[PDB]
């Protein structure tokens, strides 16, 4: 059984400017199988309103999914993205970096 590991990128749709509407994206790619748990978090707690893209795959057949939610950045809020996959000995937590 083929199994790949998720790449995880946590970024904003537009350049982050405190006090302006934006979308917080979590893009997960390069993983197999497709069973993936992906959660967006704000200050260590699951954001409930969070859409996602339709499953699709690459030239290597590995899968990818965009997870996003509208949000407005502030100077003190910490945002992160939680991913679980079979290849993952345990969920992985990626904090959002403004310059990333």
């Amino acid at each position: 059984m083929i199994q790949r590991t998720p790449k995880i990128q946590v970024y904003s749709r537009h350049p982050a400017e405190n006090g302006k509407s934006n979308f917080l994206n979590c893009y997960v790619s390069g993983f197999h199988p497709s069973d993936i748990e992906v959660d967006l978090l704000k200050n260590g707690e699951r954001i409930e309103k969070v859409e996602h893209s339709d499953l699709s795959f690459s030239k290597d057949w590995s899968f990818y999914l965009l997870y996003y939610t509208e949000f407005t950045p502030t100077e003190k809020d910490e945002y992160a993205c939680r991913v679980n996959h079979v290849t993952l000995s345990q969920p992985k937590i990626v904090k959002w970096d403004r310059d990333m």
Partner: protein, 275 residues
Amino acid sequence: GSHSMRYFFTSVSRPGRGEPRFIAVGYVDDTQFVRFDSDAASQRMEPRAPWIEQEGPEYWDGETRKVKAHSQTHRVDLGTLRGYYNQSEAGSHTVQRMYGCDVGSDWRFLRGYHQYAYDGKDYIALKEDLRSWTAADMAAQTTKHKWEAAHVAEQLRAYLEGTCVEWLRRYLENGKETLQRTDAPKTHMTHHAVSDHEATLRCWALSFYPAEITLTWQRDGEDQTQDTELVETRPAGDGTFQKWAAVVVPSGQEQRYTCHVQHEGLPKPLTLRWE
């Protein structure tokens, strides 16, 4: 320029926990326009691009009716391969299929493709000539004999060389404002001190279309491709893409480094310095 239409189909078994899941998506170029999820409420093909919204019910009933057939087909297909591979009906397995056609600048047929993958691995694929198959293992060979038998690839060629291109051109004309555009990268650099003696130059290409782009860092003309960090091109979520490449530079040499960006929506490959 050249354009493409492609459909992707995924199909995962759910041993004991219901039917196999089935997800179909369709893109023109790097733009998704339709979807079908077997676990979605509607149980219809739904749109995802603005230009396909107004296509009439007849078109939707058609596409739904034929996606449902694909669904059911892949349902059988899962069963077939559990056989070929002598596998337990206890585990979960994936069938993936992709097909489509490319067209050139003249909007005339360029090439077509149609490929399967069992459990994230190559199974069988139509070859360039759109008449011959490539079986990756023994089970795939069997399917290949089965398909050469029913003249499968003659019917495919007729979809890929006609219906597919016929419809791609339609889409391209209907969604002209969208699909026929190219957005040049909106680029810029950021500088961060890794320490007292080191800085990280990061080169941004934001908000472009199509996804294909090239970001290289150079130092006094010499490609730094090995010391360059470079993330996957990623979706912005608005129909545009982003990407960046970073180098870790010695404070005082910011000037020796250039970032070069090449895209279809650019007349002259941009060059960026920290200067």
